[PDB]
Amino acid sequence: GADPSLRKSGVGNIFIKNLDKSIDNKALYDTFSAFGNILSCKVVCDENGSKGYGFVHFETQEAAERAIEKMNGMLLNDRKVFVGRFKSRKEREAE
């Protein structure tokens, strides 16, 4: 498999919207890691650079909450990103 923690129960799971094409997993990690360790961050990239959204898996639950407050509404390289709680769908097991 890949990772069954791709829900809201992966601890510290957040989603980011409106990223710049120059944003890679490294770039996302480089910024958000300051809030806490990341196990699996991802910038879903289009041919031109990025589809305009990314995801963080934080080591710690609290670090994720920091990333949400701290990064939401900020400019990353040029584009203001929206960071929020990763609501995968509708699960009972979710934090």
Swiss-Prot record:
Residues 12-88 form the RRM domain. It is found in: Cytoplasm; Cytoplasm, Stress granule; Nucleus; Cell projection, Lamellipodium. Ubiquitous. It comes from the Eukaryota. Phosphorylated by MAPKAPK2. Methylated by CARM1. May form homodimers. Component of a multisubunit autoregulatory ribonucleoprotein complex (ARC), at least composed of IGF2BP1, PABPC1 and CSDE1. Directly interacts with IGF2BP1; the interaction is enhanced by SEPIN14P20 peptide RBPR. Part of a complex associated with the FOS mCRD domain and consisting of HNRPD, SYNCRIP, PAIP1 and CSDE1/UNR. Interacts with the PABPC1-interacting motif-1 (PAM1) and -2 (PAM2) of PAIP1 and PAIP2. Interacts with PAIP1 with a 1:1 stoichiometry and with PAIP2 with a 1:2 stoichiometry. The interaction with CSDE1 is direct and RNA-independent. (Microbial infection) Interacts (via C-terminus) with human cytomegalovirus/HHV-5 protein UL69. Binds the poly(A) tail of mRNA, including that of its own transcript, and regulates processes of mRNA metabolism such as pre-mRNA splicing and mRNA stability. Its function in translational initiation regulation can either be enhanced by PAIP1 or repressed by PAIP2. Can probably bind to cytoplasmic RNA sequences other than poly(A) in vivo. Binds to N6-methyladenosine (m6A)-containing mRNAs and contributes to MYC stability by binding to m6A-containing MYC mRNAs. Involved in translationally coupled mRNA turnover. (Microbial infection) Positively regulates the replication of dengue virus (DENV). Many viruses shutoff host mRNA translational machinery by inhibiting cellular PABPC1 activity using different mechanisms. Picornaviruses, caliciviruses or lentiviruses encode proteases that cleave PABPC1 at several defined sites in the proline-rich linker region between RRMs and the C-terminal domain. Rotaviruses, gammherpesviruses and bunyamwera virus relocalize PABPC1 from the cytoplasm to the nucleus thus altering its function. Many of these viruses translate their mRNA in a PABPC1-independent manner and are unaffected by host PABPC1 inhibition. Belongs to the polyadenylate-binding protein type-1 family. The RNA-binding domains RRM1 and RRM2 and the C-terminus (last 138 amino acids) regions interact with the PABPC1-interacting motif-1 (PAM1) and -2 (PAM2) of PAIP1, respectively. This is Polyadenylate-binding protein 1. The chain holds residues 90 to 182 of 636 of the full protein.
